[PDB]
C-alpha cells in the first residue's frame, strides 16, 4: 500500500507527470436531427411576404 520513492527527494510526491491524448470515432445510430436557423429582422418587420 505504501511504496517509497527512495531515489526521489520526496517519497510522498507523485513522481510522474502524464499527458493523455485520445481520439475516438464511433459510428452510432443516433438520429442527430437538424440545425435550426436564426430569425431575420427584415421579415415580420417590413412585410416582405405580406
Amino acid at each position: 500500500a505504501d511504496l517509497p520513492q527512495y531515489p526521489f527527494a520526496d517519497q510522498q510526491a507523485e513522481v510522474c507527470t502524464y499527458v493523455v491524448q485520445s481520439t475516438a470515432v464511433m459510428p452510432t445510430p443516433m438520429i442527430f436531427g437538424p440545425s435550426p436557423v436564426e430569425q431575420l429582422a427584415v421579415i415580420e418587420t417590413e412585410d416582405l411576404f405580406e
Binding site: 436557423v37 436564426e38 431575420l40 429582422a41 417590413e46 416582405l48 411576404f49
Partner: protein, 51 residues
C-alpha cells in the same frame, strides 16, 4: 397553402444565406435583393492578406 409554405420556407433560407455570406450588409442587402436592387460597392472595406 403548403405551396406558399414550402416556398417561403425555402425562400427564407436563401435570404439567410445572403446576410452571412455577404456580411456588413445584413438586413439591408436582402431587402434590396427582394425588390431587385443593389448597394453602393465602393464604401465597404475589404481584406488584403491573412497570415
Amino acid at each position: 397553402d403548403f405551396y406558399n409554405a414550402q416556398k417561403m420556407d425555402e425562400l427564407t433560407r436563401v435570404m439567410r444565406k445572403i446576410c452571412d455570406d455577404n456580411p456588413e450588409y445584413g438586413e439591408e442587402m436582402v431587402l434590396r435583393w427582394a425588390h431587385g436592387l443593389s448597394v453602393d460597392p465602393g464604401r465597404v472595406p475589404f481584406l488584403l492578406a491573412e497570415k
